[PDB]
Amino acid sequence: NGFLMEVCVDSVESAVNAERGGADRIELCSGLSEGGTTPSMGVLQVVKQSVQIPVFVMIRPRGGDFLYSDREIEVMKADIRLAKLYGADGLVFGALTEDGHIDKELCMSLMAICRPLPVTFHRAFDMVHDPMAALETLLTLGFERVLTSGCDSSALEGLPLIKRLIEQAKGRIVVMPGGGITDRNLQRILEGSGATEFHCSARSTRDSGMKFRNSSVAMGASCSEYSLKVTDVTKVRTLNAIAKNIL
Amino acid sequence: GFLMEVCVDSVESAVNAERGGADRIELCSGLSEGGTTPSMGVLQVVKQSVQIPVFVMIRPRGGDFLYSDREIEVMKADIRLAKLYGADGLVFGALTEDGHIDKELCMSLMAICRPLPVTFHRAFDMVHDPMAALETLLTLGFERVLTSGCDSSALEGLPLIKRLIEQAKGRIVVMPGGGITDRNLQRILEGSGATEFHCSARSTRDSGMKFRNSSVAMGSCSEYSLKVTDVTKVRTLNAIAKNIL
Amino acid sequence: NGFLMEVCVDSVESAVNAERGGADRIELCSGLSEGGTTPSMGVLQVVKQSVQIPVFVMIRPRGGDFLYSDREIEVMKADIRLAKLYGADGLVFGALTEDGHIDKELCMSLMAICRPLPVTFHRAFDMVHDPMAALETLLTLGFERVLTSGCDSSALEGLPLIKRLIEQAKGRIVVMPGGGITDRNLQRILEGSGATEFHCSARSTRDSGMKFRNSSVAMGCSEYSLKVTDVTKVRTLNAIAKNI
Amino acid sequence: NGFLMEVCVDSVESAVNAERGGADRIELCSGLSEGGTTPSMGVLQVVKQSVQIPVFVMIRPRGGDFLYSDREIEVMKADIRLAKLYGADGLVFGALTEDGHIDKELCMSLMAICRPLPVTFHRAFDMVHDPMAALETLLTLGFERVLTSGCDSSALEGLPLIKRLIEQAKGRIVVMPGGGITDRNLQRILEGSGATEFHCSARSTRDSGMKFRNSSVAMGASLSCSEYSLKVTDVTKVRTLNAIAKNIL
């Protein structure tokens, strides 16, 4: 112990696997192939009745930017209210202005509907113009946590900025590295930032059980309709053994 | 009269679809994966912004339609919540390993959907025996099937959809879907005899963001583009439908 | 009979497979991922030494538009000279203006260098603003063939315009349907367009033979699959053709 | 050599840009979206009349693995011969066995034909079972350069392994890091590996000059529309990478 591991998840099997392999917290995502959108209340319900670890709930009404229209803001608020109702232990979101600044006013009204639950500000943070200022606005606003790959393609690549962010934060806010953390990665990202909480994916692909396949059909939008991505217990295990070995 | 259906992702799209003349919207999350079950908040707001029937997708992930116990229990919970929150219909599909429709599960799920009409979705295009499949959906009581004739699109699958509509004899509404555009609608309608049809009618638009950072990928081809149900596109698809009479 | 089947090909294995399946002509089109780029001269040579059927060579310096700069044009001319030299029976290219008109002057300039080989104007044609006018321009310039999917997502999809182009051509230019044709739609394509030459890619995926695999690495999908022109696919397309 | 920079390039404009930005060497590529395919011989000719820096040439008959059949290698042999004939200043291929070993016999054949030109073993090396042992056999075969990501998804990710490889190579072979190097990760990579030569891309993406556009058409793959965009190696990106290199030591 000493470190906390978060795993984004999309199914009851993945949630259970993640808890099984030593995750301390799960983020419930839909649309993870798009960075995560707000899950259905039905997965929340079954996950909550399947796992004891906290279940944080993603509030993103679509992929793309985090410049939300009034109608998207309305959808976000309803989803906050319902996520509470059905047992979320936390909430995750992010909102920017067109200039790459966090949107204070919108963050204010979304936070007000989230309280008492902890709220982490997500990778929208990586799309910000001035991150050091962004971090400042986040804490005056009272976000417990920020998920960041240091405004770069991944946590390892963004390490130097993660490091600086942790220093600026001084424990007032949990700066969480996220984006591309693997077995091969974790130690360097931990030892190089001073972070105590981290977010990882730890999925592996598994072929479908279908015996009859029809290669002609593409349902999605433009690799196979017969593979599944599932949070892998063994991967989650080795991430935890790495975390406990650096202490 | 024809009736046109449109999958939709957001309130904006739902609204656009309605004003462009759509007769029914399906609420989908995860369009890029063929449709996943949407949050309950889109439902609620959409249900307040629109007077047209709103069908809800019940699909706990992309990929196959061979669901585990924990997945079917997620589907069951979502069906109840969707009724609770105002759905006017449900959409879903389930197959066995052999590529047959899974009667037992369809029955289970059907039982929880009642009284709402259900449409068996594109799972159907992944069947080994469509004529038999259609028969068992028929005996199970699904009102609708969405299908591209087991091919990569409605135009490509047109001969089989035509045969299906012949086999159905109006007992079930065979709805062509899959890449239906303003350019192929007339052919798809004239060549199938279909009365209802499913399209997407989206156009991709640019983000309002002035500050951009090309280095991060949330994941995809871009983080600064949006696809929205286009009113113009829905409108002309509707115009094409009122020229085929 | 009276149908010629053309197949894009990447490798000698695909070339052989094509011919062995009944193809009448092959196009050598590196970079199939991107609609075809101009192949290495070394694949021409080995293919030319492995196959009896005519081998047409693709002249495309890159993916994307067909708005070629001078340096790109310079590269296209050099590659046209080299393809001739290494035994191409035909050349394939296409060039457009900013307003989606075919580029007359550049087409004449590349044509003059291609002679006497037949030339086919390719899918660039699908990106034109007025295809009926473009067609008239292509025959005025002497392209023997045009590859086209009716300016739409695929040949089935663009079929009604392909039909109108063939009626306009009056057999003065071969209008070759191409986008996405397979065994499930061949018949329809031919019967609904009246085309006599058609273009396809009858490829199938194979698993790599690598026993040891490193999933973390990428290259510039899967790092462990192969697409290969399929003999049995090509044969069936030939059978569908012979029986119409 | 003293931070030597190599850029792999699609076209002449990009080759010219790379030279102008301070690139020391260029690898000529076709099919960059697939990790590098053997380029037409016509690019080489024109590139060779537009640039003074050495121009190395990819010999790779397709994407995917480096498990080449007989006809594939007979194409590689012909392209090596053809590339020498047209001015290649170097060669770079690389092959493997099913087991993840470098294929010694095949490498000897291809090597025999490339001589006297320098050859680099490319990122087939990252797909190898045991990279230390692989480094030895490349050393035994006489490759002057290896392009490598330390067997991971990028040079940064594989930095620790590239460090150990440079440590064991002892200057006998040039260990050149490559995956995803940029102007925001060059310094870490040089500083944490001790490498003297490095490979990057330095591209930016431009909108096509096409004014009339047809969105309904896709040329290649599967609906992976683009479609008027173009990737060109960027003079100023290469220049900044070079300034960073010169700044280190």
CA–CA distance, D53 with C233 (Å, rounded to integer): 47
Non-local (6+) Cβ contacts of C175 within 8 A are: C135, C145, C146, C148, C162, C165, C166, C169, C195
Non-local (6+) Cβ contacts of A219 within 8 A are: A225, B33, B34, B35, B62, B122, B125
CA–CA distance, A111 with A93 (Å, rounded to integer): 10
* C-beta neighbour count of C195 within 10 angstroms: 24
- Which residue reads 């983000």 in tokens? B207
Instruction: Give Cα B18 to chain centroid, integer Å.
Output: 16
Non-local (6+) Cβ contacts of B196 within 8 A are: B2, B3, B4, B5, B144, B173, B175
> Which class would CATH give D1-249?
alpha beta
Closest of D184, D119, D118, D114 to residue D155, by C-alpha: D184
Locate the domains of chain B by residue range.
Answer: 1-245
**What is the interface size between A and B, counted as CB pairs within 8 Å?**
226
Contact call for residues A75 and B10 (beta carbons, < 8 A): yes
Contact call for residues A6 and A24 (beta carbons, < 8 A): yes
Alpha carbon of B3 to those of B18, B197, B232, C7: distances in Å? 12, 7, 17, 41
Q: Does A184 touch chain D (CB under 8 A)?
A: yes
Asked if the Cβ–Cβ distance from D127 to C214 is below 8 Å, we say yes
Contact call for residues A100 and A127 (beta carbons, < 8 A): yes
CA–CA distance, B28 with B18 (Å, rounded to integer): 16
Sign of the C-alpha dihedral computed for residues D217, D221, D225 and D231 taken in this order: negative
- Tell me the three-class secondary structure of chain D, residue by residue: CCCEEEEEECCHHHHHHHHHHCCCEEEECECHHHCCECCCHHHHHHHHHHCCCCEEEECCCCCCCCCCCHHHHHHHHHHHHHHHHCCCCEEEECCECCCCCECHHHHHHHHHHHCCCCEEECHHHHHCCCHHHHHHHHHHHCCCEEEECCCCCCCCCCHHHHHHHHHHHCCCCEEEECCCCCCCCHHHHHHHHCCCEEEECCEEEECCCCCCCCCCCCCCCCCCCCCCCEEEECHHHHHHHHHHHHHHC
The region that residue A100 occupies, defined by phi over 0 for left and psi between -120 and 50 for alpha, beta otherwise, is: left
Asked if the Cβ–Cβ distance from D71 to C13 is below 8 Å, we say yes
Cβ within 8 Å of D, C 66-85: 67, 69, 71-72, 74-82
The coordinates were experimentally obtained by X-ray
Alpha carbon of A52 to those of A16, A46, A55, B70: distances in Å? 9, 12, 8, 17
Tokens of B160: 């089989």
Residues forming a β-bridge with B176: B147
Alpha carbon of A95 to those of A58, A72, B238: distances in Å? 13, 11, 36
Residues shown for chain D: 249
Neighboring chains of B (3 or more beta-carbon pairs < 8 A): A, C, D
Give the HSE-up count for residue A126: Cα atoms under 13 Å, Cβ half-sphere: 28
- Which residue reads 């070394």 in tokens? C42
* C-beta neighbour count of C58 within 10 angstroms: 26
Alpha carbon of C82 to those of C9, C78, C85: distances in Å? 19, 6, 5
State which amino acid sits at residue D224: S
Closest of B244, B241, B245 to residue B5, by C-alpha: B241
Residue of C157, C191, C221 to mutate, interface with B, max B Cβ within 10 Å:
C157
Contact call for residues D147 and D125 (beta carbons, < 8 A): yes
State which amino acid sits at residue A198: F
Angle formed by the axes of helices C70-85 and C104-114, to 10°?
20
Name the helix (H) or strand (E) containing A14.
helix A12-20
Sign of the C-alpha dihedral computed for residues D102, D104, D105 and D110 taken in this order: positive
DSSP helix/strand/coil, A206:
strand
Helices (H), A86-154: 104-114, 131-141
CA–CA distance, D83 with D85 (Å, rounded to integer): 5
Cβ within 8 Å of C, B 144-163: 151, 155-156
Residue of B76, B112, B216, B226 to mutate, interface with A, max A Cβ within 10 Å:
B216
DSSP helix/strand/coil, C56:
strand
CA–CA distance, B119 with B142 (Å, rounded to integer): 6
CA–CA distance, A56 with A48 (Å, rounded to integer): 10
Q: Is the peptide bond before A116 cis (omega within 30 degrees of 0)?
A: yes
CA–CA distance, C201 with C28 (Å, rounded to integer): 12
Domain C1-244, what fold?
TIM Barrel (3.20.20)
CA–CA distance, D150 with B64 (Å, rounded to integer): 36
Q: Does A205 touch chain B (CB under 8 A)?
A: no
> In the CATH scheme, what is the code of domain A1-247?
3.20.20.380
Name the helix (H) or strand (E) containing A85.
helix A70-85
Domain B1-245: CATH superfamily is Copper homeostasis (CutC) domain (3.20.20.380)
